[PDB]
């Protein structure tokens, strides 16, 4: 009955999962909330069960995490990095089976499930180096006998709320950075990826316990919106990193602002690719396909708007069509598959509604647009032509593989059309024009947090800060100085003299 | 005759271009179709001059003109924008004494502090000029052959700036100089009771812009009250809103800006503590506490309001503080060598009396001061209260009045906790010679504030570092370090200059 | 017969100059060495005289500079920055008359003279900001109870030797940066630009004295090779910044290394411009003209090699010839003059020798190649085609306006030819190809300190670090973190605890 | 008679060592130069033999390294970091046996041998993070339509000459950083630690080979002064990093400067500890012992001068004497051993000469001063009192455990006494005075590259740049932005417009 109780899936026990799993970890495993069953999206069969957090579970866990912080903040940052390095090795030891679980419970293809674990592994290695580097400048005081220094210290407890579509890597990016910065973490993942959240936490818990560290340093409280909301309102959650829908994210942002907390918001995108007349069409067509259909269109960075110069529009559309027809559909863990199911049946319903609404707004389905007749949550990847750039359905983010195609003529209007949506995550132009590229990157260019040239909207690397502007929420994760969001800055002046000169020469 | 600006002894006000009635809207053009306000001298309760504030149409027209000017301003390279800011710096230098005198007249702080406040603006202009050659991000090594990876920084657009009465020049200036070199345009709304100062500052800046053939709306002014501030917080065209003011109002500003996914920079109240350990140099403690507590008549966000003294030295420090308080020269604040001026409004005087009375109700002892002074203007005695518990309600209330609550302590850990227990988190100071204690105060179990000082008072930051607080102080930073990043938007940019398309994390998709 | 005594040169007195000028400043003005007369290269007439430094002058000045350092290093960097700001203002007030002196004594046209002073003004502005910023990171120690910080402190006395061709801005860039970093300076300029060194030193001296600072913070000892050799051997000169010829610079570098001092070497260039087949020729032709004939070809960053793709070589050469013919020649202070004299008579002999050797090596002089028949050191700007890329004359740096033009076909061979010389100062390519640009900026591209795209090889802005690789000497000036060359780094670990955790977990007890 | 042929030392074969080993590696192993035998300094028995490089070997190896660079420089820096990370893992796998070999062939005790490999491991970790970080700023050009960027690129071939006393960690610090910066390396170690050089090179060669990279990326040419001099004069060695004697390093710097190459010089120190009257004597005494007798006084950072305030001089000396007596002498692999032999018999001769000269200069040997009666190069750790601060013998760098102890009265004079020597590496004060600590760190304080408070002169951590000033030569290794010495800076202006504005507004 349960897939975990079948021999074809026995590899699941290599992650320590069983028929019913505790979904609270705070140094002890438990869970007194409702028992959830998660299902495989490729065939709608139940996998295994997870005991979620009650409100009392949440309360005790927050309290144990903050107690653990007293020990953890006293550990020198490079020694904290050593813990994160060992997390990276423990992920390496299980990268194949953990990525297989991502494919089974979430539904993305195996190379992407494994790639998502690799992302976590890479940010661990990055964080280990950062743990010898984080800090601020010593600055020259205008005052004799005074030192001026910028200090950075952990904020305390970092709550981390993640979404279904990257159930490993977003948590990992938040976790590795927050840890070397001296914070403790509390994780609430998507309820429909509870087994993944448990498996990752099992890997981390062993590293902590092997090092005789309190496990609440990386706490887990599986649950739904009630846990998410409690975290948003909890003054003891010093920083709340939220990855999820723009609609829920706005309310998270407001609840955290109400209590003068700190939030890091990673919200939706409505990302555009723009192909100018001089673009390399050998580069445009596969870039569009990967960015539109990768992860069955379920990335925040998924290419949802394709603008093509009038001269090459019909040619690119025809070529994209013949390439969609060759997409290989099947079970996401089957090794010769490019395209798996959507994550939920609700997502199929939303996809179907968006398609029919695109038809009612005057669009033409030139490829796809049908729910597939097969077990699971499969839909056809879809191309829609003929809508105006400001069509209501086009300015809506639908987490589904629907690509809206538009004509354009001049650079100035199409830069404006890129920027006219409420979201601001990723953006790509394809062109060879040197001038046009630097204008794209400049103040009158793209307004997004990711601004790419001759590569698609998705698949960034960990060395840079990841996030967006406008309704994408403003937060950054991973690289550059994103670590600063997980710490508090102090500006510190130390008088080591016997005099008291005042700034600006004030003679009191 | 009744207006100060029409008396010959205050004729120096006209060196700032101020007249009997002044336009309070600037956007390239001077206007003001809203209410006319009269601002008053707190040292003698006489009216100074009038300002015609912004109507709603004025605000609407100014936002549009600023955003039009941004199209031109954003195309000027940063170093050339720095040259404009450098010229603003020179303009303030040439007016520093008479502008500081106006700050003393309309706001009420003493002359060395009014001049010192203009000096901060001059300092931040100098800083921003060098920064205009420096702002940007790293070129990073991509993991992909044939790709570049670069972090770009670009202006957010229109920066709205809302300021308070108690620093009517320096807070605007720190926001303005940094926002300008970062390629933003600005829209200023100051405290209505310091409207002449806002007008005078904007006349200085507008001349530099116009002399450089630039659209004046780059540094716009819309004088007005809470309805204008509320419009700025609700306006999607205001890309970043920097708000300095009360915690209560700032919380509502932050919520409104978050409601529209705007950006906000919040600089709210403090309840700042000085802590003197038993080993402290008392010859640094007593003068430092005096300046931090009675400076600006106790009306700074960074004013010391809580003084923790080790039990072994509590009585002696209190006695020496009392003797120091009695020495303070009181007078008109624009008079050189005056050390103590009036509170900004009559209401503040009443709230001073209110807090003193509540402090007595809660069991405290007024060991010095506590009364209004018998003279013209809004003068109160700088006041010292002993005997309250550290958790007394009146001691957890920011009041822009010169009242210092003094507490005893014994142990390091408890007094760090008492520093951290309040809702605000702006500034903090310990006085001690102990090396370990100092690094613990600066560390993760030490002060939770944005300013963490050792052997100096809570007030008087230099411009080279970032300025701001944590917790209910709102989290914004101004001035130094990389505070400039709050005025720009980061983008992480990958440029494929090859003929292949390898994907991150080595993912194969064919 | 001195120019300074003629009515039309009376503006020289606005710089405090007179008939015979003291060439030593250390708080007081002096000079007991040989008196030198400098001459205007536009008419070979004498301008004025400078009393140079004796050994006793040099000895007394080094001692005074190091005594002043005790005061100067105690002044907070932002307060030092305020001094540099006032130097910037005193330069702005005299920019026209100082530019004019640069034109008269050095010989570059007035816009470049004024523009060189502007460089110094610009870097003052930059340094004022830097004075609030210089320092190092606080780093996380692996040891509990320990702080780990990087401190930066001045080296002490910075000796600065400069050349004739940029007699203001190279000193200025070293000066502003060394000053905000807490160092005192000792200047020895080119003897043929002694009046410019004196006039600059007078402007700075007034600012120091006006601020009640000891004037030896910016000391001057005008002299020849004897003073520069003394500086290179002097253990009291903590950093020697030397701008000049590769030959002299190599010996300076050795002498400083012999005594374990620090040196900043800014030496010669043999800079190439490369025009690919896809280049905007409306960009190539004016860019090549400016880089090759600007300052009469006497910049270290002057373009001396021009690589043009085979397809466009003849078209570019003809357009450049037509462009050379339209250059306006005359007195460099006269309006709209774009080309003035070479700096010395010796430079004119070198110009002629290089051209003869060019034809000997098989070259073809397609334009110029002769001295002009007029007073001063005027030579025709010259274009030579037909040499191989590795001809001897083309690998030698001659401070004369001679442009060597080469054909190429493929990108990899021409990148290599850029890199094949001993110098490594500046380089430039003209192209629209996005991949070619990033390869030129990458590890298999240009090996130079300055690597440009669609602009010539000369005229840098101050925001970045300036200098070259290979025989150019490795030093950097002005922008980015060039300031670190003027300071010493310390790595400082502070135990504030009551324990002694050892690094790498070594248990030794 | 060879220890490697005794079954007692069979653990050496875990490092791939044999009776006769190849001392040249460039992807293949060889060596046509003289065969050197290295000896164990604790018993003067021969360990094994190494075939050193002939000049022909060196020429062949330089050429192969330069060709390998063309491949290596094209590998993206993060992927170069992945190679270094694997090098770090390969060292972890052999840390005990490699640490034992350091103790056997060099002579330091086992916790320090192991700890020296740990330095290398830690710098690999650090460099892995750096590999995603190295580069320069994008700057705002004053010219419209222009970009201004600071690029950093590899210099090419980095020659690395190391010394006997840290035969692993110094090479490692140079190697890990140079690798991620895109350089190839050529290593010439101390002839008397040739077996250590081969063993480290064997570990790195396996990683390179497993990753299908040319082995000459980390070349080795074992040899003496002829190889070292060829490297210093070789224009193909773009950067030469030299750790060693001040006398030899001066000639290396001159030879490199003659050819306009780059050199990084890490030379000797004459390092001082200063104990003020308010110092915690419980910190002072152990720190002085570890810093003075650690590694039998053979570190470049060894404490050789101890300045004690007059009021506490006698009590500190007496307490140090009572402590030196409890130093445990034995073989450097025997357990609980604090103190081993000197590296050579010549070092013993220099030791006796220095003790004899110190006595003739008026010093009193208050502890030690004599050769130990046992096999190997053992000498007693020695304390000398009574000398003036400028005594001739105290201003020699004798690489042996002799601590010269001086009195002082005032801060200004003893700071000057710290600074009066020719070397400028490490320095340390013990005090509680805030004002004195910040003066020591400031412009009138220590003139050294390492400036410590309440910790001794040795044992620095990898996060900061390591090196000294004055006759210590000025190079830096390891942390902060020391990576910049291994790369070349370029300032790059890109005109993406159709206009030609000149800098400073010059109209031509
Ligand atoms: O530290 C202070 O008192 C603060 C500084 C910035 C402007 C307002 N006042």
PDB file of N, CA and C in Angstrom, chain C residues 70 74 141-143 150-151 153 250 258 441 443-444 446 449 451-454 459-461 465 469 476 480-481 484 488-489 491-493 495, chain D residues 70 74 141-142 150-151 153 250 258 262 441 443-444 446 449 451-454 459 461 465 476 480-481 484 488-489 491-493 495 503-504:
ATOM      1  N   UNK C  70      56.328  62.474  13.304  1.00  0.00           N
ATOM      2  CA  UNK C  70      55.865  62.259  14.676  1.00  0.00           C
ATOM      3  C   UNK C  70      54.592  63.040  14.980  1.00  0.00           C
ATOM      4  N   UNK C  74      50.150  61.331  14.259  1.00  0.00           N
ATOM      5  CA  UNK C  74      49.237  61.398  15.395  1.00  0.00           C
ATOM      6  C   UNK C  74      47.932  62.101  15.059  1.00  0.00           C
ATOM      7  N   UNK C 141      38.185  35.047  14.858  1.00  0.00           N
ATOM      8  CA  UNK C 141      39.207  34.123  15.332  1.00  0.00           C
ATOM      9  C   UNK C 141      38.611  32.738  15.549  1.00  0.00           C
ATOM     10  N   UNK C 142      39.420  31.702  15.291  1.00  0.00           N
ATOM     11  CA  UNK C 142      39.035  30.341  15.645  1.00  0.00           C
ATOM     12  C   UNK C 142      39.159  30.065  17.135  1.00  0.00           C
ATOM     13  N   UNK C 143      39.674  31.019  17.907  1.00  0.00           N
ATOM     14  CA  UNK C 143      39.911  30.848  19.335  1.00  0.00           C
ATOM     15  C   UNK C 143      38.865  31.633  20.117  1.00  0.00           C
ATOM     16  N   UNK C 150      42.943  43.193  11.310  1.00  0.00           N
ATOM     17  CA  UNK C 150      43.973  43.657  10.396  1.00  0.00           C
ATOM     18  C   UNK C 150      44.092  45.169  10.536  1.00  0.00           C
ATOM     19  N   UNK C 151      45.256  45.628  10.968  1.00  0.00           N
ATOM     20  CA  UNK C 151      45.531  47.049  11.106  1.00  0.00           C
ATOM     21  C   UNK C 151      46.408  47.511   9.951  1.00  0.00           C
ATOM     22  N   UNK C 153      49.008  50.945   9.114  1.00  0.00           N
ATOM     23  CA  UNK C 153      49.688  52.121   9.655  1.00  0.00           C
ATOM     24  C   UNK C 153      50.655  52.687   8.621  1.00  0.00           C
ATOM     25  N   UNK C 250      65.056  50.161 -13.000  1.00  0.00           N
ATOM     26  CA  UNK C 250      65.545  48.840 -12.619  1.00  0.00           C
ATOM     27  C   UNK C 250      66.625  48.946 -11.546  1.00  0.00           C
ATOM     28  N   UNK C 258      68.141  45.974  -2.019  1.00  0.00           N
ATOM     29  CA  UNK C 258      69.381  45.730  -1.294  1.00  0.00           C
ATOM     30  C   UNK C 258      69.250  46.107   0.179  1.00  0.00           C
ATOM     31  N   UNK C 441      39.958  40.439 -21.802  1.00  0.00           N
ATOM     32  CA  UNK C 441      39.992  40.773 -20.383  1.00  0.00           C
ATOM     33  C   UNK C 441      40.369  39.588 -19.510  1.00  0.00           C
ATOM     34  N   UNK C 443      42.317  35.457 -18.840  1.00  0.00           N
ATOM     35  CA  UNK C 443      43.679  34.990 -18.538  1.00  0.00           C
ATOM     36  C   UNK C 443      44.533  34.768 -19.767  1.00  0.00           C
ATOM     37  N   UNK C 444      43.929  34.615 -20.948  1.00  0.00           N
ATOM     38  CA  UNK C 444      44.670  34.456 -22.195  1.00  0.00           C
ATOM     39  C   UNK C 444      44.635  35.726 -23.041  1.00  0.00           C
ATOM     40  N   UNK C 446      45.058  40.313 -22.724  1.00  0.00           N
ATOM     41  CA  UNK C 446      46.123  41.277 -22.489  1.00  0.00           C
ATOM     42  C   UNK C 446      46.798  41.039 -21.145  1.00  0.00           C
ATOM     43  N   UNK C 449      48.715  46.203 -17.325  1.00  0.00           N
ATOM     44  CA  UNK C 449      48.027  46.769 -16.171  1.00  0.00           C
ATOM     45  C   UNK C 449      46.770  47.527 -16.532  1.00  0.00           C
ATOM     46  N   UNK C 451      43.830  47.605 -19.549  1.00  0.00           N
ATOM     47  CA  UNK C 451      43.301  46.754 -20.613  1.00  0.00           C
ATOM     48  C   UNK C 451      41.968  47.354 -21.050  1.00  0.00           C
ATOM     49  N   UNK C 452      41.964  48.066 -22.180  1.00  0.00           N
ATOM     50  CA  UNK C 452      40.819  48.855 -22.626  1.00  0.00           C
ATOM     51  C   UNK C 452      40.127  48.276 -23.861  1.00  0.00           C
ATOM     52  N   UNK C 453      38.878  48.711 -24.051  1.00  0.00           N
ATOM     53  CA  UNK C 453      38.027  48.289 -25.163  1.00  0.00           C
ATOM     54  C   UNK C 453      37.358  49.527 -25.753  1.00  0.00           C
ATOM     55  N   UNK C 454      37.614  49.789 -27.032  1.00  0.00           N
ATOM     56  CA  UNK C 454      36.993  50.875 -27.791  1.00  0.00           C
ATOM     57  C   UNK C 454      37.325  52.259 -27.228  1.00  0.00           C
ATOM     58  N   UNK C 459      45.033  58.347 -20.978  1.00  0.00           N
ATOM     59  CA  UNK C 459      43.994  59.138 -20.340  1.00  0.00           C
ATOM     60  C   UNK C 459      43.126  58.397 -19.338  1.00  0.00           C
ATOM     61  N   UNK C 460      43.743  57.800 -18.318  1.00  0.00           N
ATOM     62  CA  UNK C 460      42.982  57.044 -17.330  1.00  0.00           C
ATOM     63  C   UNK C 460      42.226  57.978 -16.393  1.00  0.00           C
ATOM     64  N   UNK C 461      41.140  57.463 -15.812  1.00  0.00           N
ATOM     65  CA  UNK C 461      40.480  58.175 -14.723  1.00  0.00           C
ATOM     66  C   UNK C 461      40.994  57.675 -13.373  1.00  0.00           C
ATOM     67  N   UNK C 465      43.168  51.771 -10.040  1.00  0.00           N
ATOM     68  CA  UNK C 465      44.607  51.746  -9.823  1.00  0.00           C
ATOM     69  C   UNK C 465      45.329  51.892 -11.155  1.00  0.00           C
ATOM     70  N   UNK C 469      52.590  46.028 -15.633  1.00  0.00           N
ATOM     71  CA  UNK C 469      53.258  44.782 -15.285  1.00  0.00           C
ATOM     72  C   UNK C 469      54.592  44.676 -16.019  1.00  0.00           C
ATOM     73  N   UNK C 476      51.302  50.516  -8.459  1.00  0.00           N
ATOM     74  CA  UNK C 476      50.009  51.120  -8.763  1.00  0.00           C
ATOM     75  C   UNK C 476      49.862  52.436  -8.007  1.00  0.00           C
ATOM     76  N   UNK C 480      41.352  52.363  -6.454  1.00  0.00           N
ATOM     77  CA  UNK C 480      41.108  51.035  -5.878  1.00  0.00           C
ATOM     78  C   UNK C 480      41.818  50.984  -4.525  1.00  0.00           C
ATOM     79  N   UNK C 481      42.589  49.938  -4.216  1.00  0.00           N
ATOM     80  CA  UNK C 481      43.304  49.868  -2.943  1.00  0.00           C
ATOM     81  C   UNK C 481      44.798  50.116  -3.115  1.00  0.00           C
ATOM     82  N   UNK C 484      47.170  50.796  -0.111  1.00  0.00           N
ATOM     83  CA  UNK C 484      47.875  49.830   0.718  1.00  0.00           C
ATOM     84  C   UNK C 484      49.380  49.841   0.477  1.00  0.00           C
ATOM     85  N   UNK C 488      51.769  49.827   6.151  1.00  0.00           N
ATOM     86  CA  UNK C 488      52.164  48.474   6.530  1.00  0.00           C
ATOM     87  C   UNK C 488      51.000  47.774   7.208  1.00  0.00           C
ATOM     88  N   UNK C 489      50.795  46.532   6.796  1.00  0.00           N
ATOM     89  CA  UNK C 489      49.761  45.674   7.335  1.00  0.00           C
ATOM     90  C   UNK C 489      50.295  44.956   8.558  1.00  0.00           C
ATOM     91  N   UNK C 491      48.752  41.861  11.322  1.00  0.00           N
ATOM     92  CA  UNK C 491      47.720  40.908  11.665  1.00  0.00           C
ATOM     93  C   UNK C 491      47.800  40.719  13.168  1.00  0.00           C
ATOM     94  N   UNK C 492      46.730  41.084  13.859  1.00  0.00           N
ATOM     95  CA  UNK C 492      46.784  41.320  15.292  1.00  0.00           C
ATOM     96  C   UNK C 492      45.763  40.438  15.977  1.00  0.00           C
ATOM     97  N   UNK C 493      46.224  39.633  16.929  1.00  0.00           N
ATOM     98  CA  UNK C 493      45.363  38.751  17.704  1.00  0.00           C
ATOM     99  C   UNK C 493      45.402  39.198  19.155  1.00  0.00           C
ATOM    100  N   UNK C 495      44.022  38.383  22.879  1.00  0.00           N
ATOM    101  CA  UNK C 495      43.386  37.524  23.872  1.00  0.00           C
ATOM    102  C   UNK C 495      42.814  38.404  24.976  1.00  0.00           C
TER     103      UNK C 495
ATOM    104  N   UNK D  70      48.114  26.324 -19.551  1.00  0.00           N
ATOM    105  CA  UNK D  70      47.158  26.692 -20.593  1.00  0.00           C
ATOM    106  C   UNK D  70      45.828  25.981 -20.392  1.00  0.00           C
ATOM    107  N   UNK D  74      42.139  27.881 -17.932  1.00  0.00           N
ATOM    108  CA  UNK D  74      40.803  27.831 -18.522  1.00  0.00           C
ATOM    109  C   UNK D  74      39.769  27.164 -17.626  1.00  0.00           C
ATOM    110  N   UNK D 141      32.431  54.665 -13.667  1.00  0.00           N
ATOM    111  CA  UNK D 141      33.218  55.536 -14.529  1.00  0.00           C
ATOM    112  C   UNK D 141      32.670  56.959 -14.512  1.00  0.00           C
ATOM    113  N   UNK D 142      33.576  57.935 -14.592  1.00  0.00           N
ATOM    114  CA  UNK D 142      33.141  59.312 -14.780  1.00  0.00           C
ATOM    115  C   UNK D 142      32.658  59.579 -16.202  1.00  0.00           C
ATOM    116  N   UNK D 150      37.793  46.204 -12.349  1.00  0.00           N
ATOM    117  CA  UNK D 150      39.092  45.693 -11.929  1.00  0.00           C
ATOM    118  C   UNK D 150      39.084  44.178 -12.071  1.00  0.00           C
ATOM    119  N   UNK D 151      39.919  43.660 -12.977  1.00  0.00           N
ATOM    120  CA  UNK D 151      40.057  42.230 -13.215  1.00  0.00           C
ATOM    121  C   UNK D 151      41.309  41.684 -12.539  1.00  0.00           C
ATOM    122  N   UNK D 153      43.817  38.180 -12.822  1.00  0.00           N
ATOM    123  CA  UNK D 153      44.137  36.987 -13.590  1.00  0.00           C
ATOM    124  C   UNK D 153      45.403  36.341 -13.045  1.00  0.00           C
ATOM    125  N   UNK D 250      67.552  37.759   0.605  1.00  0.00           N
ATOM    126  CA  UNK D 250      67.996  39.023   0.028  1.00  0.00           C
ATOM    127  C   UNK D 250      68.529  38.822  -1.394  1.00  0.00           C
ATOM    128  N   UNK D 258      66.075  41.865 -10.636  1.00  0.00           N
ATOM    129  CA  UNK D 258      66.883  42.073 -11.831  1.00  0.00           C
ATOM    130  C   UNK D 258      66.118  41.733 -13.110  1.00  0.00           C
ATOM    131  N   UNK D 262      58.219  38.746  -9.967  1.00  0.00           N
ATOM    132  CA  UNK D 262      57.592  38.971  -8.672  1.00  0.00           C
ATOM    133  C   UNK D 262      58.198  38.038  -7.633  1.00  0.00           C
ATOM    134  N   UNK D 441      49.160  48.691  18.904  1.00  0.00           N
ATOM    135  CA  UNK D 441      48.591  48.392  17.585  1.00  0.00           C
ATOM    136  C   UNK D 441      48.642  49.574  16.620  1.00  0.00           C
ATOM    137  N   UNK D 443      50.380  53.586  15.173  1.00  0.00           N
ATOM    138  CA  UNK D 443      51.517  53.986  14.335  1.00  0.00           C
ATOM    139  C   UNK D 443      52.816  54.162  15.091  1.00  0.00           C
ATOM    140  N   UNK D 444      52.776  54.290  16.415  1.00  0.00           N
ATOM    141  CA  UNK D 444      53.975  54.365  17.240  1.00  0.00           C
ATOM    142  C   UNK D 444      54.183  53.094  18.057  1.00  0.00           C
ATOM    143  N   UNK D 446      54.259  48.478  17.724  1.00  0.00           N
ATOM    144  CA  UNK D 446      55.088  47.474  17.070  1.00  0.00           C
ATOM    145  C   UNK D 446      55.157  47.724  15.567  1.00  0.00           C
ATOM    146  N   UNK D 449      54.837  42.445  11.390  1.00  0.00           N
ATOM    147  CA  UNK D 449      53.682  42.004  10.631  1.00  0.00           C
ATOM    148  C   UNK D 449      52.642  41.299  11.477  1.00  0.00           C
ATOM    149  N   UNK D 451      51.217  41.381  15.392  1.00  0.00           N
ATOM    150  CA  UNK D 451      51.238  42.267  16.558  1.00  0.00           C
ATOM    151  C   UNK D 451      50.184  41.751  17.530  1.00  0.00           C
ATOM    152  N   UNK D 452      50.622  41.055  18.581  1.00  0.00           N
ATOM    153  CA  UNK D 452      49.751  40.253  19.429  1.00  0.00           C
ATOM    154  C   UNK D 452      49.644  40.858  20.822  1.00  0.00           C
ATOM    155  N   UNK D 453      48.517  40.584  21.487  1.00  0.00           N
ATOM    156  CA  UNK D 453      48.237  41.032  22.852  1.00  0.00           C
ATOM    157  C   UNK D 453      47.815  39.821  23.683  1.00  0.00           C
ATOM    158  N   UNK D 454      48.575  39.530  24.743  1.00  0.00           N
ATOM    159  CA  UNK D 454      48.273  38.472  25.714  1.00  0.00           C
ATOM    160  C   UNK D 454      48.252  37.077  25.081  1.00  0.00           C
ATOM    161  N   UNK D 459      52.281  30.531  16.368  1.00  0.00           N
ATOM    162  CA  UNK D 459      50.978  29.907  16.200  1.00  0.00           C
ATOM    163  C   UNK D 459      49.860  30.825  15.742  1.00  0.00           C
ATOM    164  N   UNK D 461      46.740  31.922  13.080  1.00  0.00           N
ATOM    165  CA  UNK D 461      45.695  31.185  12.381  1.00  0.00           C
ATOM    166  C   UNK D 461      45.570  31.640  10.925  1.00  0.00           C
ATOM    167  N   UNK D 465      46.436  37.377   6.948  1.00  0.00           N
ATOM    168  CA  UNK D 465      47.671  37.347   6.168  1.00  0.00           C
ATOM    169  C   UNK D 465      48.874  37.159   7.090  1.00  0.00           C
ATOM    170  N   UNK D 476      53.325  38.135   2.219  1.00  0.00           N
ATOM    171  CA  UNK D 476      52.229  37.609   3.020  1.00  0.00           C
ATOM    172  C   UNK D 476      51.722  36.307   2.415  1.00  0.00           C
ATOM    173  N   UNK D 480      43.285  36.944   4.602  1.00  0.00           N
ATOM    174  CA  UNK D 480      42.915  38.273   4.115  1.00  0.00           C
ATOM    175  C   UNK D 480      42.999  38.318   2.586  1.00  0.00           C
ATOM    176  N   UNK D 481      43.521  39.404   1.992  1.00  0.00           N
ATOM    177  CA  UNK D 481      43.674  39.481   0.537  1.00  0.00           C
ATOM    178  C   UNK D 481      45.091  39.127   0.072  1.00  0.00           C
ATOM    179  N   UNK D 484      45.967  38.238  -3.630  1.00  0.00           N
ATOM    180  CA  UNK D 484      46.308  39.187  -4.690  1.00  0.00           C
ATOM    181  C   UNK D 484      47.779  39.107  -5.120  1.00  0.00           C
ATOM    182  N   UNK D 488      47.534  39.013 -11.232  1.00  0.00           N
ATOM    183  CA  UNK D 488      47.871  40.329 -11.764  1.00  0.00           C
ATOM    184  C   UNK D 488      46.603  41.150 -11.917  1.00  0.00           C
ATOM    185  N   UNK D 489      46.667  42.399 -11.460  1.00  0.00           N
ATOM    186  CA  UNK D 489      45.555  43.330 -11.526  1.00  0.00           C
ATOM    187  C   UNK D 489      45.550  44.039 -12.876  1.00  0.00           C
ATOM    188  N   UNK D 491      43.175  47.255 -14.783  1.00  0.00           N
ATOM    189  CA  UNK D 491      42.133  48.264 -14.696  1.00  0.00           C
ATOM    190  C   UNK D 491      41.571  48.432 -16.099  1.00  0.00           C
ATOM    191  N   UNK D 492      40.277  48.161 -16.264  1.00  0.00           N
ATOM    192  CA  UNK D 492      39.719  47.889 -17.583  1.00  0.00           C
ATOM    193  C   UNK D 492      38.554  48.829 -17.845  1.00  0.00           C
ATOM    194  N   UNK D 493      38.641  49.608 -18.920  1.00  0.00           N
ATOM    195  CA  UNK D 493      37.580  50.535 -19.284  1.00  0.00           C
ATOM    196  C   UNK D 493      36.977  50.085 -20.610  1.00  0.00           C
ATOM    197  N   UNK D 495      34.222  51.026 -23.472  1.00  0.00           N
ATOM    198  CA  UNK D 495      33.328  51.976 -24.120  1.00  0.00           C
ATOM    199  C   UNK D 495      32.286  51.194 -24.913  1.00  0.00           C
ATOM    200  N   UNK D 503      39.021  61.506 -20.295  1.00  0.00           N
ATOM    201  CA  UNK D 503      39.139  61.713 -18.856  1.00  0.00           C
ATOM    202  C   UNK D 503      39.539  63.151 -18.553  1.00  0.00           C
ATOM    203  N   UNK D 504      39.117  63.621 -17.379  1.00  0.00           N
ATOM    204  CA  UNK D 504      39.288  64.994 -16.914  1.00  0.00           C
ATOM    205  C   UNK D 504      38.670  66.022 -17.859  1.00  0.00           C
TER     206      UNK D 504
END
